[PDB]
Ligand binder design. Structure first.
Ligand code: CA
Length: 223
């Protein structure tokens, strides 16, 4: 997260870190057994780390649970990033309390102008590289479809939306991938892609979670 703020420990209780020996992506806990992330975050051997603030220090609220299964969206295209969503099942159920909690799925899509919270452990610089240990947060609005398409001609599908600031300076970034965009207490987006980070006229692009609620529910019901 570039141009954000330190969230505070366990203030974003649905935020998870996906670990394969190291943090590599975010995700969102949606029930005691299941995490939503980006399909471009797929790999084998994932350990889900819940209750994290400093990802390099054991602070007392962590739950580390290996994944039993990953399900990339049936129509994910890694070239275009269309359908950039993946479900991960935990081998055991997380213990839920105020520091580790699920986030609700949307019942309706969000509109341009809605304020959201984007979070993660990704790079905090727009030029060069600095990875934080503690969770970072950014409040940002959803942008209009027309501004999003204008920013990224030929690239924005109906399964994507832009959020952030066209002036630059405030965005998600590498290492935030897969993590949440939460608006009014609902998971509306997944950190997906963008051109660099925090660049002028190049806002963040996010997977439009409301399109996937049917798939998520039916997949959980049978897996
Ligand atoms: Ca920790």
């Amino acid at each position: 997260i570039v141009g954000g703020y330190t969230c505070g420990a366990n203030t974003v209780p649905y935020q998870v870190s996906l670990n394969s020996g190291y943090h590599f992506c975010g995700g969102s806990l949606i029930n005691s057994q299941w995490v939503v992330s980006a399909a471009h975050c797929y790999k084998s051997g994932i350990q889900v780390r819940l209750g994290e603030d400093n990802i390099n220090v054991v602070e007392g609220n962590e739950q580390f649970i290996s994944a039993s299964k990953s399900i990339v969206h049936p129509s994910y295209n890694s070239n275009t990033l269309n359908n950039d969503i993946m479900l991960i099942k935990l081998k055991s159920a997380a213990s839920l309390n105020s520091r580790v909690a699920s986030i609700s799925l949307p019942t309706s899509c969000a509109s341009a102008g809605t304020q959201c919270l984007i979070s993660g452990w990704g790079n905090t610089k727009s030029s060069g590289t600095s990875y934080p240990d503690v969770l970072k947060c950014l409040k940002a609005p959803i942008l209009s479809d027309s501004s999003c398409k204008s920013a990224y001609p030929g690239q924005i599908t109906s399964n994507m939306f832009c959020a952030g600031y066209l002036e630059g300076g405030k965005d998600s970034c590498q290492g935030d991938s897969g993590g949440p965009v939460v608006c009014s207490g609902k998971l509306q987006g997944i950190v997906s892609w963008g051109s660099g980070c925090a660049q002028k006229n190049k806002p963040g692009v996010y997977t439009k979670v409301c399109n996937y609620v049917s798939w998520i529910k039916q997949t959980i019901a049978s897996n």
